[PDB]
Design a protein around this ligand. Structure first.
Ligand SMILES: *[C@@H]1O[C@H](CO)[C@@H](O[C@@H]2O[C@H](CO)[C@@H](O)[C@H](O)[C@H]2NC(C)=O)[C@H](O)[C@H]1NC(C)=O
Ligand SMILES: *[C@@H]1O[C@H](CO)[C@@H](O)[C@H](O)[C@H]1NC(C)=O
Ligand SMILES: *[C@@H]1O[C@H](CO)[C@@H](O)[C@H](O)[C@H]1NC(C)=O
Ligand SMILES: *[C@@H]1O[C@H](CO)[C@@H](O)[C@H](O)[C@H]1NC(C)=O
Ligand SMILES: *[C@@H]1O[C@H](CO)[C@@H](O)[C@H](O)[C@H]1NC(C)=O
Ligand SMILES: *[C@@H]1O[C@H](CO)[C@@H](O)[C@H](O)[C@H]1NC(C)=O
Ligand SMILES: *[C@@H]1O[C@H](CO)[C@@H](O)[C@H](O)[C@H]1NC(C)=O
Ligand SMILES: *[C@@H]1O[C@H](CO)[C@@H](O)[C@H](O)[C@H]1NC(C)=O
Lengths: 254, 297, 49, 64, 119, 99, 49, 49
């Protein structure tokens, strides 16, 4: 089952500043009270991060490139954002990755889904509407895990695809800022490593409708792109990354 | 002192002679208590193998791999390991083991090595320069040859550019010839990339079908899931021991620690990159590793 | 910055020690920078190299 | 080369491209190279940060 | 001399099956591998399938279960069964021949057959 | 020439344009067994041996490494580690005679 | 060889090119596609090897 | 020869710089002193050596 959403309002996507967000732990090694230089796929400091809204009538589910990696930020309240779609052609010709977080558990499946043009979940005012794919024939990887999840909640994720491994890094932050990204530093802990082994060039955000037509709950998300660069990370006495330096941002940090 | 100064008479003074180092007393091996065997029977003893252009990749994880049944088998004509010794394969714990299975003819088995050139290396299956793993190949004339000719195995004769390491090309696309496009029959007739092997049992050696399994490893980064048959020893505190934690070897005293490791975090590294703390499998505790007492005499 | 000459000597010596310790992390073209890994992974004919 | 005061004082920096003409890269041409980010002044002071060829830099913005 | 002729083209409903035939005349049908290729109007050529003397059939990964290649060597013919026809399969089909003891040059080609699907 | 007395032409001290030869459409067979056709224009060799003869259409495959046939065993034999390219073309319009 | 014969009995002319890579100098080389010359810019030049 | 002391320093510095440049023309046992010739004539496993 697929449903076209024809009540959207036309608006260009916005842009804003990354500040010093998007830093994740580069490896699984404990380091304490040290300054470590690492060269990896990182999000550049003060970069141009693309801003998408969900407000009522805005419902931003575009087709975005994946490139080398994706930083995904979410200023979320009332749980609209439910998952992501990764793939190349997003049809039954190629193999695609599904990550969903419904009311019970987090499900990761690697199958050849025949995806809808507008994949979505739904909340009735209980969840009783799910229209993401019409079929799933050849499934190789399944992984059921714990639930990962004024705007009250900040969700940071880093998605990387190296050597057939999909690294998802996550950080959950209590915030009370109304509209934009808060300015500060928070190192993203690694959440999960998935052995999917598939080609990914395009990705989709999955949202949830509110029914009482449809109504979009208030949410906002941000997409940034990772580039290969060097960071100087500071590890405190407790092994937590407390500050970072982008080695190629400006001559002072260089 | 006489031996150090190379003289039978030693003048008055202080002389640096050697470096005292306390030796370890016993070896403790700590490995996960996983007991599942790895499905090597489903890989080596499979009835059907895919072609070299569309080689089969099976990810082997979360099991105990008994490599001693591979080397001691006399079936394998070629057992060449790069970056690891086959005898030591039982003693090591790996991560991200990959089994790549395909069928190639006899004289192309030399091309399944890092740094080889040919049709298979460039356009079908490319190994990296820094490849660690094992290439295993054995004759399969009595299974993969038919009297009329076996036509199920095909190789990619030509590609526009060379393949990247561990890159699969299952894409079958019509390609051109030169100065005229492939806009129908009108132009220069269009070449096909995939060519089948001529497998007959009467063929001489070098043309016969050989089954190739390539084992690929990753050297100690994330927590290891594929470990050898080695058993786990008990843990001893505050004594100099030569330990082996998931393939990480070393000598030191294992002590209690106050380092608040995060759940993902397993080990710790100093400036020199030598391991300073480790998380033991089975019990998940965090043991600090302090080098055994040494100094100048 | 009154006592810069002594601090300069201390910094140079500490930096030389830090560089000498850091040089153990380099493999210099070998498969690994750790000797125990080479001794546990390879037979003596190639572990010698 | 990066010419800076202490980070306790300021985060302003100047960049010296040694032996590079300024047309091949607050832009000033010195015999040492091209200095970007420092305002050249006609006054003479004591040398605080040495640039070279008689040019020195100081913080008061960064002047050369 | 060498000649490939085809039959089975026409204007047919979508979902109805088709059987395209490729008759070979002038050369012995053995020791050669036979190809089915299609080209759409305004689009380049797309390879469909391969069949050998053994009977091993290899299909394009892009399209699955739509076609079935059937070789016959008593009368030197090649058959294609097409099932579950979609609207996008309007194309000119070609029968191709490669030699098994060489590179994949497709040598001589069929004149082609026209398949038009409509409702 | 005939296949029992195949003409051997030695190519040396010259620049060889393999692009014209590869792009020629008269050739029904341009099959290489040790090199790549697209890298012929980049590589350099000491000398080239060109062996020219006429055979039957069914015996064209017999000029191959590892191939056993009457032409392979008695007329023209290639080594197992052969490098180079075999080019063959139909000559019905020229060589053939009605008698 | 007759014109009435089909493909397989028709005469085929075969030229076999074999390459030698001995210690002799490589007299036989591929064509040399010279491009246009660009001056006053930092370019990668390849002049006669 | 009045100013030989300064001229010796200038000559030593220039000669050391010239020697450091001339060390680039030595292959040090390799097949060629040019990296591009090695990268174009050999595969990366032996070009690496
Ligand atoms: C929702 O809209 C999309 C895009 O308009 C529809 O996708 C197209 O559907 C037509 C109908 O046959 C096809 O001809 C096109 O090829 C489709 N395009 C793509 C890019 O898929 C989609 O069908 C609509 N959903 C429903 C349920 O009708
Ligand atoms: C971000 O990009 C948009 C267009 O892509 C541009 O108009 C805007 O100025 C950019 N912002 C920054 C801070 O570079
Ligand atoms: C991944 O897909 C894109 C387009 O879908 C393609 O260009 C690219 O080569 C693919 N990469 C791999 C490794 O398959
Ligand atoms: C959540 O998704 C899983 C997997 O599809 C399913 O088994 C489960 O019933 C779902 N829960 C709800 C409440 O929809
Ligand atoms: C993928 O699914 C299709 C249809 O379900 C099937 O025909 C095909 O064989 C499957 N692929 C594999 C590799 O099994
Ligand atoms: C480190 O942890 C201790 C308690 O374990 C805490 O008191 C201290 O503030 C922490 N350090 C920082 C910089 O927050
Ligand atoms: C394959 O079968 C033989 C038959 O006994 C057995 O000895 C061998 O161990 C098997 N191989 C594997 C990998 O299990
Ligand atoms: C085995 O190891 C797992 C972790 O891999 C641990 O959770 C479990 O308690 C261990 N079991 C025993 C009996 O040691």
């Amino acid at each position: 089952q697929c449903v076209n959403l024809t009540t959207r309002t036309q608006l260009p996507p916005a842009y804003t500043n990354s500040f010093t967000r998007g830093v994740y732990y580069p490896d699984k090694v404990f380091r304490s009270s040290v300054l470590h230089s690492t060269q990896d796929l990182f999000l550049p400091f003060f970069s141009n991060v693309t801003w998408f809204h969900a407000i009522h009538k805005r419902f931003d589910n575009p087709v975005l490139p994946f490139n080398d990696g994706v930083y995904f930020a979410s200023t979320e309240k009332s749980n609209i954002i439910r998952g992501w779609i990764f793939g190349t052609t997003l049809d039954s010709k190629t193999q695609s990755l599904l990550i969903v977080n419904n009311a019970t558990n987090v499900v990761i499946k690697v199958c050849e889904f025949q995806f809808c043009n507008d994949p979505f979940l739904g909340v009735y005012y209980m969840e009783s509407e799910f229209r993401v794919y019409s079929s799933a024939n050849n499934c190789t990887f399944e992984y059921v895990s714990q639930p990962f999840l004024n705007f009250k909640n900040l969700r940071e994720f880093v998605f990387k695809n190296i050597d057939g491994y999909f690294k998802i890094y996550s950080k959950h932050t209590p915030i009370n800022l109304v509209r934009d990204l808060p300015q500060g530093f928070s190192a993203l802990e690694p959440l999960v490593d998935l052995p999917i082994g598939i080609n990914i060039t395009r990705f989709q955000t999955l949202l949830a409708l509110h029914r009482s037509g449809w109504t979009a709950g208030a949410a906002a998300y941000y997409v940034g792109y990772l580039q290969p660069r060097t960071f100087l990370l500071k590890y405190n006495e407790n092994g937590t990354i407390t500050d970072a330096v982008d080695c190629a941002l400006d001559p002072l940090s260089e | 002192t006489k031996c150090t100064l190379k003289s039978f008479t030693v003048e008055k003074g202080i002389y640096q002679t050697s470096n005292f180092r306390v030796q370890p007393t016993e070896s403790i091996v700590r490995f996960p208590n996983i007991t599942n065997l790895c499905p090597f029977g489903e890989v080596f003893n499979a009835t059907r193998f895919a072609s070299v252009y569309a080689w089969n990749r099976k990810r082997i994880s979360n099991c105990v791999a008994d490599y001693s049944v591979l080397y001691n088998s006399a079936s394998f004509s070629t057992f060449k390991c790069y970056g690891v010794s086959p005898t030591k394969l039982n003693d090591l714990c790996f991560t991200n083991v990959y089994a790549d299975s395909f069928v190639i003819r006899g004289d192309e088995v030399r091309q399944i090595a890092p740094g080889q050139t040919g049709k298979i290396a460039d356009y079908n299956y490319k190994l990296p320069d820094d490849f660690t793993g094992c290439v295993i190949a054995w004759n399969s004339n009595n299974l993969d040859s038919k009297v009329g000719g076996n036509y199920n195995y095909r190789y990619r004769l030509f590609r526009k550019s060379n393949l990247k390491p561990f890159e699969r090309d299952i894409s079958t696309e019509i390609y051109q010839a030169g100065s005229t496009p492939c806009n129908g029959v009108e132009g220069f007739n269009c070449y096909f990339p995939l060519q089948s092997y001529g497998f007959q049992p009467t063929n001489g050696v070098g043309y016969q079908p050989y089954r190739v399994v390539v084992l690929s490893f990753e050297l100690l980064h994330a927590p290891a899931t594929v470990c050898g048959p080695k058993k786990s020893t008990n843990l001893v505190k505050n004594k100099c021991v030569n330990f082996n934690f998931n393939g990480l070897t070393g000598t030191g005293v294992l002590t209690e620690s106050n380092k608040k490791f995060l759940p993902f975090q397993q080990f710790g590294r100093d400036i020199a990159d030598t391991t300073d703390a480790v998380r033991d499998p089975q019990t998940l505790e965090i043991l600090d590793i302090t080098p055994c007492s040494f100094g100048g005499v | 910055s009154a006592l810069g000459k002594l601090q300069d000597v201390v910094n140079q010596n500490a930096q030389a020690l830090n560089t000498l310790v850091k040089q153990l992390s380099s493999n210099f073209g070998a498969i690994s920078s750790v000797l125990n890994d080479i001794l546990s992974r390879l037979d003596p004919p190639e572990a010698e190299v | 080369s990066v010419i800076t005061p202490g980070t306790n004082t300021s985060n302003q920096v100047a960049v010296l491209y040694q032996g590079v003409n300024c047309t091949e890269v607050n832009v000033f041409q010195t015999r040492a190279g091209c200095l970007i980010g420092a305002e050249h002044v006609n006054n003479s002071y004591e040398c605080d940060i040495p640039i070279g060829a008689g040019i020195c830099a100081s913080y008061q913005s960064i002047i050369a | 001399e060498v000649q490939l002729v085809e039959s089975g083209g026409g204007v047919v409903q979508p979902g109805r099956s088709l059987r395209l035939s490729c008759a070979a005349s002038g050369f012995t049908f053995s020791s050669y591998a036979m190809h089915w290729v299609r080209q759409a109007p305004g689009k380049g050529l797309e390879w469909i399938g391969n069949i050998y003397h053994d009977g091993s059939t290899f299909y394009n990964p892009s399209l699955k279960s739509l076609v079935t290649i059937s070789r016959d060597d008593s009368t030197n013919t090649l058959y294609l069964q097409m099932n579950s026809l979609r609207a996008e399969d309007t194309a000119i089909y070609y029968c191709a021949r490669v030699w098994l003891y060489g590179s994949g040059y497709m040598d001589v080609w069929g004149k082609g057959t026209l398949v038009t699907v409509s409702s």
